[PDB]
């Protein structure tokens, strides 16, 4: 036709969502004057406590956790009694954030007067003037800025902020959105001696990442990734999954995170109920035709067949499983059948940087960008899981092949990795 093309060509172009790009992102590479080795940690925790049951548990945790010798702690856990103050934890928040945004505003040319949306997430530390107000005061941003400060949402709040800055870029056209994911280790230190609350002492390390999104069309040739899907899953309605990761107080009055002993049966449930909801979105139609077409041959033929999980290798090229521990990347490799090159960024990020809470996925993305394995057209899958057992997921798509020197946190030590990780660090 020639006249019925404005009606079909108008209601379609006003129903499609505005595309959300990832222009660039900067991560914090912590200095070498803040690293905590294995023996330094096991000498500090042997001078702090007096009982032998609490140290032989931390040895068994730390020598099998998979961390390395370059994991960094803030400069208040380097004293033999750690003295976490409000000023000493705020001065670390001005170090991990302001040196990650200054890395971002010199590699993108971003003026600070151009940031319209600012989403900052941090689990434990949140002052009365928030971290978003601190970023506004440091960089002198606009007065009509949309500043949100999510807090208390656990280690999976890195993909809640991405979904928030995706939903705030559909309403407001032609805007830039700065997303800062961080974790302040200084008020997180548990002073007591309860054997189920010492697990956030041996895993959480320094790290922060600043992420710049936009929905302009000028930044569609300069951008790197285009966000395709964000799938959220909150298993907090279950009464045993709400109290799985739980902030309590012990018998002496020291607050800390109390991990339950049935966590790997709950973390294996929020993963399989988020993979189920993201399966029909990203799997190809040639491989989705063994669920609309094989399940007919169960209810009438035989209930109980050979176990056929759908292979997600034919849907993605790069996997970015959150580096929570060693006991969660093996179980997500075993039943999903991933090659050792697939779970390699998630292992070497845990080995080099440790369990950075919210921003581990961006170090895992910088690993794949640093080796030169991110070609043009690849799909990146980032999985996260948190404290109330939110288990969020995001699927990106690379727009242009990133050249091999990236000036990220990995470029000073990328000629050594991947190094072999031992099963037990022998002491």
């Amino acid at each position: 036709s020639a006249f019925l093309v404005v009606f079909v060509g108008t209601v379609y172009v006003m129903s499609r969502p505005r595309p959300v790009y990832l222009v660039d992102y900067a991560c914090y590479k912590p200095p070498a004057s803040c690293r905590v080795p294995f023996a330094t940690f096991m000498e500090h925790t042997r001078l702090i406590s007096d009982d032998d049951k609490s140290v032989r548990f931390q040895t068994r945790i730390l020598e099998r956790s998979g961390l390395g010798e370059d994991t960094c702690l803030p400069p208040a856990n380097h004293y033999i009694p750690p003295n976490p103050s409000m000023e000493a934890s705020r001065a670390e928040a001005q170090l991990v954030i302001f040196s990650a945004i200054d890395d971002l505003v010199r590699r993108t040319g971003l003026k600070p007067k151009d940031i319209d949306i600012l989403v900052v997430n941090c689990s434990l530390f949140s002052p009365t003037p928030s971290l978003s107000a601190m970023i506004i005061n440091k960089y002198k941003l606009r007065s009509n800025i949309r500043s949100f400060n999510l807090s208390g949402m656990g280690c999976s709040a890195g993909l809640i902020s991405i979904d928030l800055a995706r939903d705030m870029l559909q309403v407001h056209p032609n805007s830039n959105a700065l997303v800062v994911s961080t974790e302040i280790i200084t008020p997180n230190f548990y002073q007591g001696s309860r054997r189920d609350m010492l697990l956030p002492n041996c895993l959480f390390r320094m790290g922060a990442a600043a992420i710049l999104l936009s929905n302009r069309r000028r930044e569609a040739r300069r951008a790197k990734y285009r966000l395709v899907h964000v799938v959220r899953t909150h298993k907090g309605a279950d009464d045993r999954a709400y109290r799985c990761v739980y902030e309590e107080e012990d018998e002496q009055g020291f607050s800390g995170i109390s991990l339950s002993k049935e966590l790997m049966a709950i973390a294996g449930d929020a993963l399989k109920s988020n993979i189920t909801t993201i399966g029909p979105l990203v799997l190809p139609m040639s491989e989705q035709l063994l669920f609309f077409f094989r399940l007919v041959g169960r209810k009438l033929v035989n209930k109980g067949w050979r176990p056929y999980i759908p292979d997600f290798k034919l849907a993605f090229e790069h996997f970015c499983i959150h580096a929570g521990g060693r006991a969660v990347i093996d179980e997500l490799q075993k039943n999903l059948q991933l090659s050792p090159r697939h779970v390699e960024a998630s292992r070497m990020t845990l080995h080099r940087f440790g369990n950075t809470s919210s921003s581990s996925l961006w170090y895992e993305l910088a690993y794949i960008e640093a080796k030169g394995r991110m070609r043009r057209g690849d799909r990146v899958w980032q999985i996260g899981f948190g404290s109330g057992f939110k288990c969020n997921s995001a699927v990106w798509k690379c727009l242009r092949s990133i050249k091999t020197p990236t000036n990220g946190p990995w470029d000073d030590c990328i000629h050594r990795y991947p190094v072999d990780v031992p099963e037990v660090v022998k002491l």
């Binding site: 023996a39 000498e43 009694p81």
Partner: protein, 411 residues
């Protein structure tokens, strides 16, 4: 006016060493029960915070990575009676103890009180937690008047005294913006079996200890460090008239004077133990114990009725060397103060080279720990390079009788 507010902290090497096992020498295990405490007094502590004093310790411990290690024990595949220790170079750390005092520093320097090095250096040892005991403690004391007293508690296992002072100067040269010399750890140490069971008579074989590398003394010890000026150093050279001998009259006169003053108090110290920290016998390595342990016999008259000149002539040619058999011994050795009165020759050592920015130190004294029940005499150099500073570590009952007897020579 005592020190208070100790905040402990550690510093690690900046680069991962890997799985390296530093093997100790045969002379590194004879000196394992002794410790070195040295205080470096600074007059103006302006701009010297405890972050600018800690930041060069991360590149400095990269050159000197066995200092940040921990003592371990190898296994015996044959008979299991000996187990040779070694330094496992895991980057465990070096203690930094920030303290502060409310006294005047230039008054505490000229105090002559028995016991000052124990308060400014952190007193610990390779103790009952032997696998988790640091080999070096650094205590930074900020005084009330603005002074600064760095106290280095150095274990004599890993290094010597001239291998401690140049190792500290290699940190002060990194802090000062200079470029330090290259460290040498490249030839590894290997044991040589010589099957020597004869205990040398310059040392005293203490019993088999297993997890506390320190001999607790019966008498209580204290470090009294007096001063020997230039006007007495030319006074002691005037009884060498009519004879031209090899009495090098800045160690062999001063220490013979202290030998006579101690033999005036005690019964009969006929033999001594001269431990020369010689500079011509040093090898290229940066962490090794090339001391010269010997013994000097009186062979005749007592040293209480003999003049200082004859006790200087006796101490220069009659040194019977025993540093080769001390290292080849199998038990525990206890060199300093074990068998006889120990005389150390720490006078050619560059103590005052710890210029941290441009600040030459005002007073540097070196004491010891783990000294046995006989005594140690450490003849150190003065600030202006002309006098001698003598730190005398004796039992506390023999110090008050020593200051009265030594006043008749120094004036």
């Amino acid at each position: 006016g005592a020190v208070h507010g100790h905040r402990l902290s550690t510093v690690v090497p900046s680069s991962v060493t890997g799985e390296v096992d530093y093997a100790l020498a045969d002379a590194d295990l004879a000196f394992k029960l002794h410790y070195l405490r040295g205080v470096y007094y600074y007059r103006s502590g302006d701009g010297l915070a405890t972050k600018v004093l800690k930041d060069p310790m991360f590149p400095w411990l990269d050159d000197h990575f066995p200092v940040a290690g921990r003592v371990r024990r190898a296994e015996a595949e044959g008979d299991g009676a000996p187990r040779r220790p070694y330094i496992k170079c895991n980057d465990c750390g070096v203690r930094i103890v920030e303290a502060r005092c409310d006294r005047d520093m230039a008054e505490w320097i000229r105090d002559a009180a028995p016991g000052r090095i124990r308060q400014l250096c952190y007193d610990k040892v390779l103790g009952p937690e032997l696998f988790f005991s640091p080999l070096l403690y650094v205590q930074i004391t900020n005084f009330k008047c603005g002074g600064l007293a760095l106290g280095f508690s150095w274990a004599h296992l890993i290094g010597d005294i001239p291998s401690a002072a140049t190792c500290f100067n290699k940190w002060a040269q990194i802090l000062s913006g200079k470029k330090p010399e290259a460290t040498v750890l490249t030839p590894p140490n290997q044991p040589l079996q010589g099957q020597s069971p004869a205990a040398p008579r310059s040392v005293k074989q203490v019993g088999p200890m297993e997890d506390l590398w320190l001999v607790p003394a019966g008498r209580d010890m204290a470090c009294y460090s007096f001063h020997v000026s230039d006007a007495v150093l030319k006074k002691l050279h005037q009884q060498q008239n009519g004879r031209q001998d090899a009495a090098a009259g800045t160690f062999e006169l001063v220490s013979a004077l202290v030998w006579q003053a101690v033999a005036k108090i005690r019964g009969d110290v006929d033999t001594v133990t001269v431990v020369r920290a010689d500079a011509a016998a040093r090898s290229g390595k940066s962490l090794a114990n090339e001391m010269k342990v010997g013994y000097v016999e009186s062979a005749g008259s007592s040293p209480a009725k003999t003049d200082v000149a004859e006790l200087a002539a006796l101490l220069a040619k009659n040194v019977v060397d025993e540093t080769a058999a001390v290292a080849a011994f199998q038990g525990d050795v206890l060199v300093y103060g074990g068998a006889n009165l120990t005389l150390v020759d720490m006078e050619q050592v560059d103590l005052y080279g710890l210029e941290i920015k441009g600040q030459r130190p005002v007073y540097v004294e070196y004491g010891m720990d783990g000294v046995g029940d006989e005594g140690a005499v450490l003849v150190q150099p003065d600030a202006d390079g002309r006098g001698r500073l003598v730190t005398v570590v004796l039992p506390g009952d023999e110090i008050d009788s020593l200051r009265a007897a030594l006043g008749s020579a120094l004036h």
